[PDB]
């Protein structure tokens, strides 16, 4: 619901949603947005749908279908280098989706925008060093850049405090035409605990495996940590409820 509320941010300004201890349904997320492209790295897409992990990380931003190739860790494209980076060590599933016309309450940004280049001048007079975004981190160069880039070509410059480093930080902003239907890119970075998996696929106990309708039948029972083999019979309440 927090992902649905409001308008999705740019790829550099991507908001981060983290789920540590709750049952997750991939299908529920898929139902909200039709998935134009599905790709996953280090794990099968089918496997991601139903497996337990210690924690689940979801990153949501508005990303157009045309520039998807540029946003890859393998790709040397500027958008991956100066905007959003997904950690290679933990398995990452990348999903590009298009908002349905039926879906409502999703605000649309004026146009999709990305940081064309991010760099810091080591020496102001003649030295410029390119800066590559560290994995995630909401973009270090984002402070100079506005939430939505004003023009296709933009110049941003600011000066770091001396000592340190007293070096000018410079960023560039580029924009692309807005699609008639909003397109949103989702990055998922699941990690697995060695012995503990707090987040699991819905639901831990099946609806079919319930005491009701099993009356008069010998059945194995695992209720609230009490495991035994027994027959259940409906009867008038006795003892403290």
């Amino acid at each position, epitope marked *: 619901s927090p992902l649905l509320s409001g308008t999705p941010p740019q790829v550099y300004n991507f908001k981060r949603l983290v789920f540590t201890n709750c049952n997750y349904n991939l299908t529920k997320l898929l139902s909200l947005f039709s998935v134009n492209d599905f790709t996953c790295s280090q794990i099968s897409p089918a496997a991601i749908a139903s497996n337990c992990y210690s924690s689940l990380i979801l990153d949501y931003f508005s990303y157009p279908l045309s520039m998807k190739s540029d946003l890859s860790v393998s790709s040397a494209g500027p958008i991956s280098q100066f905007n959003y980076k997904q950690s290679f060590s933990n398995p990452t599933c990348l999903i590009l989706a298009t908002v349905p016309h039926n879906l409502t309450t999703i605000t649309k940004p004026l146009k999709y925008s990305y940081i*064309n*280049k991010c*760099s810091r*001048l080591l020496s102001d007079d*003649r030295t*410029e060093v390119p800066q590559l975004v560290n994995a995630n981190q909401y973009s270090p160069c984002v402070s100079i850049v506005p939430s939505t880039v*004003w*023009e296709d*070509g*933009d*110049y*941003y*410059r600011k000066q770091l405090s001396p000592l340190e480093g007293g070096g000018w930080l*410079v960023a*560039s*902003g580029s924009t692309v035409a807005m699609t008639e239907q909003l397109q949103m890119g989702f990055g998922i970075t699941v990690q697995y605990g060695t012995d503990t998996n707090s987040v699991c696929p819905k639901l831990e106990f099946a609806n079919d495996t319930k005491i009701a309708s099993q009356l008069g039948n010998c059945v194995e029972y695992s209720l609230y940590g009490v495991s035994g083999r027994g027959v259940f019979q409906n009867c008038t309440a006795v003892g403290v409820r």
Partner: antibody
Framework: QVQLVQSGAEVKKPGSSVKVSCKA??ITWVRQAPGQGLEWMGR????????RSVQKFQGRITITADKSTSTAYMDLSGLTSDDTAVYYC?????????????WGQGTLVTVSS | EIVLTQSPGTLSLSPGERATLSCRAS???????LAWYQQRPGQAPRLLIY???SRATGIPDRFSGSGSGTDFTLTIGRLEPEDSAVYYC?????????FGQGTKVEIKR
């Protein structure tokens, strides 16, 4: 403070390629027709390497700025005879502050056969 | 692109008389996004006011930036023979940025 200087005025035939050189932030190029208001042509930043052009002058002007060269070069190709004007290179504060503190001496380009 | 109206231009102003320059904008522009440039005859333009709020460094405070949204007025407290120049108001709120038609200033002593 960086002093701004420009190449000597050059007479060119129409359809030629005039490379006006502004010798040693961002570099902006302004064309002023004689007895007329100044017109902004392009915004090129040497450190960024980014190039911007006005809609009227699009696809006819190639503007290159290199930090290592420290010199901004503008090339105009297939310019019309009416295009003759004095050209000024002006320092650019940035997208947030598009005002030109320092202006180059200027180059007059004449295009008559 | 914003088309911008300008004051008529050549005016006869005695020294010590305040001079007012009008820069109306046909299309709405940012409340403080205008630049005034003064060029002496046969000389490159120099910025006087940035944002129509504060004078540029190395620029006399006699020129004052005033007005917002549509009309921007430049007022000079004192006029000198060296105040005679063409003044242009440039709006960088809308791209492409548009320079003013310009106003010639004449000082007669």
């Amino acid at each position: 403070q960086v002093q701004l200087v420009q190449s000597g005025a050059e007479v060119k035939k129409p359809g030629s390629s005039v490379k006006v050189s502004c010798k040693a932030y961002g570099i902006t190029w302004v064309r002023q027709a004689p007895g007329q208001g100044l017109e902004w042509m392009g915004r090129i930043i040497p450190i960024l390497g980014i190039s911007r052009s006005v809609q009227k002058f699009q696809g006819r002007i190639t503007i290159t700025a290199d930090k290592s060269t420290s010199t901004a070069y503008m090339d105009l190709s297939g310019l019309t005879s009416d295009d003759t004007a004095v050209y000024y290179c002006a320092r650019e504060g940035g997208s947030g502050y598009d005002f030109f503190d320092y202006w180059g001496q200027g180059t007059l380009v004449t295009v008559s056969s | 692109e914003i088309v911008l109206t300008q004051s008529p231009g050549t005016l006869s102003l005695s020294p010590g008389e305040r001079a007012t320059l009008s820069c109306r904008a046909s299309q709405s522009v940012s409340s403080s996004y205008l630049a005034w440039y003064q060029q002496r005859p046969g000389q490159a333009p120099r910025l006087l006011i940035y944002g129509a709020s504060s004078r540029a460094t190395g620029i006399p405070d006699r020129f004052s930036g005033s007005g917002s949204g549509t009309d921007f007025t430049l007022t000079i407290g004192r006029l000198e023979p060296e105040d005679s120049a063409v003044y242009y108001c440039q709006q960088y709120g809308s791209s492409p940025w548009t320079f003013g038609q310009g106003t010639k200033v004449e000082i007669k002593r």
